[PDB]
Symmetry: D2
Subunit: 114 residues, 4 copies
Amino acid sequence: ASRGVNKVILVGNLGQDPEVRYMPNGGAVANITLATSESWRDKATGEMKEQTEWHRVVLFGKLAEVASEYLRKGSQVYIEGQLRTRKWTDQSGQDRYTTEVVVNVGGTMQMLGG
Amino acid sequence: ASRGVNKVILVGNLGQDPEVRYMPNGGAVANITLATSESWRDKATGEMKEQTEWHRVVLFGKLAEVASEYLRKGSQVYIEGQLRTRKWTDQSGQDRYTTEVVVNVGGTMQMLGG
Amino acid sequence: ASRGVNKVILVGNLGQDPEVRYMPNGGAVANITLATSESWRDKATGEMKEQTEWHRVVLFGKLAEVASEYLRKGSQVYIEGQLRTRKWTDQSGQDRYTTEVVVNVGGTMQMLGG
Amino acid sequence: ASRGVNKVILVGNLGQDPEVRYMPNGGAVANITLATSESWRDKATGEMKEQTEWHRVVLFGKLAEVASEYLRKGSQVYIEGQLRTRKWTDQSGQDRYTTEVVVNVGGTMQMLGG
């Protein structure tokens, strides 16, 4: 009615080991970078094309901890979270924006290995 | 699986009328802005709290045409798209990145309500 | 690989007034029925075909209480839940299965009008 | 908006081999069964409880042909479809309903892991 719905679903692999950070000012946070791709074989070129998107995902608390422990580069994972654009001034005085996929509360992540 | 899943689902209100453009031998394109919110009936100083996110949605083809003809500020809509981050040069000629929800052949847009 | 993912996302209208019930536990349950539709076009159906699915949705606790008080025949509503097939024996005393969209602690229900 | 949204996202493992069947009139249709589970060590005792849901997933055309060749018992897949409840009278004159996850034109299936 005014709240609305803000839902991201991803399945993809980590392009790097997770970077995890503890804080007795909150507890864990983990940043992960996920790739999702799209493959082609275009008529012009003759040979294969491809286009990969990198997604910045931030996990918190128990999930961040889980991430530090199990998730490594190349790992396949499922994520339900939400979009968050945050503002920051960089060192040369410029206002900048980073939109991230944040998994909290009623988001999820799951590992599609074994 | 290299490929993966890249899906965004939004339900929210347009913050402005749709901003519509044709193109080279143009197909239609339309940039819209969707608000989604999260209350927080907190302590604070006496009352609740609020954070809204604005999402940058881009529509192509018939949907772009449709949005221009029948969508206005405050319309409630459901959107299914995918995340895309594009790079672009700014007024000073440094890099700037924008992540947006692109609604494509695969996506959907529906007007909600009563 | 166990657990997996079990997610239903619905937007539609109540076919009926919500039926609310309290279980001996103490806590509410609401059974609602939600209509979604898809429209057609065809050839020796120069007419338009419409198929509507009725989904059986069950809500527990506070979300059931909310439903009773606020939701009505016609209300449009957004639901995240999971699929449950329950088994039940009928008057002749034989086995029958019903698959329902259960909205739990994992899921959500949101009123899309006011 | 009558119409609305009817979406199922599943990630799970095939409980058995794909049952595929061709039509000399409308190509392949494949039936697969997918498990999703939920574990909790709870409560009275301290012992491990499981509950698994089985989903009847129907694939059409090219996804069905793909399923035939590559999908086996235990394969892990991601599915995006819609719910369908169909009616049928069984042989002892009684009305029955089966609810199924249908993967159409707007859905997808992706094979996961490795």
